Amino acid sequence: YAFVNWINKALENDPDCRHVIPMNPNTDDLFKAVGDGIVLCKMINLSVPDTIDERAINKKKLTPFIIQENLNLALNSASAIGCHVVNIGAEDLRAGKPHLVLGLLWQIIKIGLF
């Protein structure tokens, strides 16, 4: 649970990420939505909110069978900060893995802070 608070204090650079990662209540909403790459598009709101909106890129027209459209749409916007783990693709991030998520969060922490 302390990892949730650590990630919150590290990523408050973009408060909009707190709508994906837990917002200090130590829940587990991080894995599935971060595997979809929503935080990557949100992270730009650090300096200017005038960017990819959370409800503009995804308003859950991910139909009750195919929820496969948000993950690649949001992970393709990873030009910011840069997923230095180029081993991983959106195929495996569809579900998410501990080591893979930690490796991507490594870049998130590293470039999120100037």
Partner 1 sequence: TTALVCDNGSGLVKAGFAGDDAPRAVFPSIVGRPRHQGVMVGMGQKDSYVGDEAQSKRGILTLKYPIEHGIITNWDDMEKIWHHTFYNELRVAPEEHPTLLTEAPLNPKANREKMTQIMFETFNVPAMYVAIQAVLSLYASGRTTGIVLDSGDGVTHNVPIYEGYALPHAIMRLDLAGRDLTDYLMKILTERGYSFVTTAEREIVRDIKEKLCYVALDFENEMATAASSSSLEKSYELPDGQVITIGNERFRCPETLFQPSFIGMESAGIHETTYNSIMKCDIDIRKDLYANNVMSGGTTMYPGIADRMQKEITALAPSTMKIKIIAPPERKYSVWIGGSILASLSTFQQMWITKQEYDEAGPSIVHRKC
Q: Which residues bind partner 1 (CB under 8 A)?
A: 58-59, 61-66, 68-73, 75-76, 84-92, 97, 99-100, 102-107, 110
What are the tokens at 27?
């829940």
CB of 36 to partner 1, least distance (A): 11
Number of CB atoms found within 10 A of residue 84's CB: 12
Nearer to partner 1, 26 or 69 (CB): 69
What CA–CA distance (Å, rounded) separates 8 from 4? 6
CB of 48 to partner 1, least distance (A): 25
